[PDB]
């Protein structure tokens, strides 16, 4: 019914409580509290400063994003590029991190062309950021953003960089990102962060 | 179908809302994550801070999570005895995909201030992660699980329960093992955060 489009991702996810294991394909998952992420964000901040913490959370999202794309790219290979790609936004929702809503998506692997304009609703990272830091001067959704780039870059076979254009933690109403190839704008965390120092 | 009779009161409270990007455990949001966030964290801190501060950090982060599950399951089993209610922490640890708890021994009394737990830990996510980043250890490596056991147990018992991991897959045993007793019964010897910080340094001196 409500899951027609994600059932193939659901079928890959196994909860085996009695043996202490959650599997997404052949990868272990953990169920964690968002407030623990908030705690870890704050503790790293104190120990290492904002840049290193930001760099940490983006790198993590980035590897997670690439891992999910390894797993989901084997699925759907009898479908067209947009439907396949949508596994990424879909995992973010299944994982409980954010709801992706597509304003605009243009993509072709062979053309090396990509452009995404998405809204992010109920970002967990904006919530835990307000909680620990109060209202922010900059977008807060570092991990989610890393995951966007990583997932997107694996699927397209080149560096796709995203920018969080509007963020719930800066008072905006929903979060929103725009994704394009590096040029139209791997330590790509440097780029994402450099990129956001563009007023 | 349901030999989850044990943990149904816990699963009952888990709600997945994939359309809306949300997972709930009671009123708390949760996430499903890759172990790589922790594997990364563990690598980054090992080289920026060294082993001792890395290990303290993970015990701290397990301790906060254990305490939190204790908060959320506190009022959960009023018509079972202390033990079967305590079992929620071990059970959550399994529900969360972290480790599987198999009891060798468990006796507790809140009011007699008595606690002994001897548990096998099987399938430790943390032992896998330590191995695939650091290889074999000369000592037990399940820091964050140990932190959890201690934060959870200390809350439930209203006092300092310290655990020791006497065997660990990370150092080539076949499963991990732990003994937990009150701080007063170990053969060696203000703010409410400041108390956690102390407990966390104690579970760290092994
Ligand atoms: Zn945001
Ligand atoms: Zn271990």
Curated annotation (Swiss-Prot), chain A:
Result for mutant: residue 120 to A: 6-fold increase in Kd for phenol
Domain of life, per lineage: Bacteria
Outcome of substituting residue 175 to A: Exhibits extremely low solubility
Induction of its expression: Constitutively expressed at a low level from a sigma70-type promoter.
Binding site for phenol: 92, 120
Binding residue positions for Zn(2+): 141, 164, 167, 175
Quaternary organization: Homodimer.
Free-text note on domains in this protein's UniProt record: Contains an N-terminal signal reception (A) domain, followed by a hinge region (B domain), a transcription activation (C) domain and a C-terminal D domain. The A domain directly responds to external signals, the C domain contains the ATP-binding region that provides energy, and the D domain contains a helix-turn-helix DNA binding motif.
Primary role: Involved in the regulation of the phenol degradation pathway. Activates phenol hydroxylase expression in the presence of phenol.
Protein name according to UniProt: Phenol regulator MopR
Species of the source: Acinetobacter guillouiae
Gene encoding the protein: mopR
Parent-protein residues present: 15 to 225 of 560
